[PDB]
Amino acid sequence: MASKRALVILAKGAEEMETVIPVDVMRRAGIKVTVAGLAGKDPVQCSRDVVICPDASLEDAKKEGPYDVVVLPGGNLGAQNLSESAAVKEILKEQENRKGLIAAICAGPTALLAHEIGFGSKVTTHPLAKDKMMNGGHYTYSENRVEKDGLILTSRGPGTSFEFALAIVEALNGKEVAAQVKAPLVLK
Amino acid sequence: ASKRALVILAKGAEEMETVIPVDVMRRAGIKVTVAGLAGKDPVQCSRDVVICPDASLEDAKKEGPYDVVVLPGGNLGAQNLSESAAVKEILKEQENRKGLIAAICAGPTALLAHEIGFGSKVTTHPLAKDKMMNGGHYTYSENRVEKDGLILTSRGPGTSFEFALAIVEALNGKEVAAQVKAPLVLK
Numbered sequence: 190m191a192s193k194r195a196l197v198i199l200a201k202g203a204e205e206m207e208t209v210i211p212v213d214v215m216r217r218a219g220i221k222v223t224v225a226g227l228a229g230k231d232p233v234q235c236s237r238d239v240v241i242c243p244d245a246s247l248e249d250a251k252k253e254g255p256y257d258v259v260v261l262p263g264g265n266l267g268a269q270n271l272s273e274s275a276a277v278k279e280i281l282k283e284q285e286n287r288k289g290l291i292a293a294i295c296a297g298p299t300a301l302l303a304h305e306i307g308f309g310s311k312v313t314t315h316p317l318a319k320d321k322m323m324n325g326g327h328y329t330y331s332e333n334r335v336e337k338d339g340l341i342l343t344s345r346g347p348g349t350s351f352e353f354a355l356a357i358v359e360a361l362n363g364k365e366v367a368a369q370v371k372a373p374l375v376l377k
Numbered sequence: 378a379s380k381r382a383l384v385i386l387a388k389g390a391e392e393m394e395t396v397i398p399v400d401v402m403r404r405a406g407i408k409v410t411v412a413g414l415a416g417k418d419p420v421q422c423s424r425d426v427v428i429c430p431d432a433s434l435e436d437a438k439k440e441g442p443y444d445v446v447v448l449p450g451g452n453l454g455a456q457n458l459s460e461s462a463a464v465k466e467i468l469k470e471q472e473n474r475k476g477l478i479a480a481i482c483a484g485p486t487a488l489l490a491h492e493i494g495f496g497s498k499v500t501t502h503p504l505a506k507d508k509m510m511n512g513g514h515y516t517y518s519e520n521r522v523e524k525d526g527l528i529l530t531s532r533g534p535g536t537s538f539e540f541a542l543a544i545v546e547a548l549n550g551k552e553v554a555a556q557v558k559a560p561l562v563l564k
Contacts, residue, residue, distance in 0.1 A: 204400075205396050205399075205400050206393075206396055206397055206400050209392050209393055209396045209426055210393050210396075210397075212392075212424070212426055213391075213392050213393050213424045213426065213534075216424045216425065217424065224426065232419075232429050236400075237399065237400040237403040237404060238403065239396055239399055239400065239411065239428060240428065240429035241426060241427065241428055241429075242419050242427035242428070242429060315560075315562065316562065317560075334562075334564065345562045346560070346561060346562030347400075347538075347560075347561040347562065347563075348538065348561040348562040348563030348564060349562060351534075351535065373504075373533070373534075374533060374534040374535040375502060375503065375521075375532045375533035375534065375535045375536055376534070376535030376536075377521070377535065377536075
């Protein structure tokens with residue numbers, strides 16, 4: 190059967206929790222995750238300054254077949270870097286056409302806007318991110334902690350990272366896997 | 378002056394349990410130092426995400442005392458903290474200095490390894506309870522967060538936000554703690 194695969198794009202200024210949590214939860218679900226550094230293989234300084242080292246650069250990871258889900262962490266600077274990246278624009282455009290699940294969280298969804306994706310999809314973001322995301326009314330807004338409209342999965346913030354991560358797991362590997370991975374976390 | 382925290386990062390440490398507290402405490406204006414138990418090299422956590430310490434434990438230990446030292450969880454991470462002579466000395470002094478010690482998941486078993494806070498009311502991850510209670514050195518609790526005096530413990534990944542916010546309240550107060558929680562968009 191093999192295993193599902195995830196491409197997590199880590200850009201300078203990314204929100205540490207929104208990236209680490211999903212990466213952890215997914216690897217627990219049995220999905221092979223690749224933390225692809227946007228600027229290369231060098232270490233990445235996040236929104237609160239924790240430094241995470243990419244498994245590989247976005248340049249290389251990009252040359253490794255198709256991913257079952259592309260996840261974009263949040264973080265003011267990180268989402269910005271993602272928004273301004275031609276590399277990200279191509280990956281997102283392609284994943285979309287390939288009918289591949291795309292997952293963004295916090296400010297992360299504003300990267301879909303920058304790259305004109307999912308137009309017309311129901312979405313949610315960080316409350317303070319709504320303004321930017323809804324400019325030009327390209328999406329319907331949601332206030333659900335986790336919003337999944339077809340193949341566009343979005344979430345509101347650090348506090349929603351587990352529901353976000355688990356939502357991704359269910360979509361990829363099913364509910365039983367999701368429930369098994371959830372128990373140990375000792376979540377409320 | 379800002380409060381200070383020392384986070385001891387070891388191979389096999391639970392990524393989320395180390396990242397969430399660091400992020401949240403820094404949001405609280407707390408100057409935190411991620412200390413690498415083994416040195417200054419990147420640390421491979423329980424689920425393979427690699428984190429770069431701010432410095433090595435050796436040198437973090439030399440930069441004044443800390444308002445709180447936190448012990449991440451994770452099987453291997455907890456076991457490395459336990460077998461660390463240096464970790465035992467950091468903790469002993471903190472307990473003497475009447476300073477907050479905070480451990481989560483399997484992390485509090487390091488406290489048992491180093492005979493810290495004996496007789497204290499503590500909690501751990503469900504699966505780390507028999508080891509934690511071996512010898513009846515502690516009183517067990519099931520609250521998601523247990524703060525018995527200067528000994529603050531938690532149960533696992535899903536309680537990290539409460540574990541971290543608990544540390545913030547203890548150090549910077551209730552107001553600063555709620556100011557930090559608001560944006561996190563926690564339920």
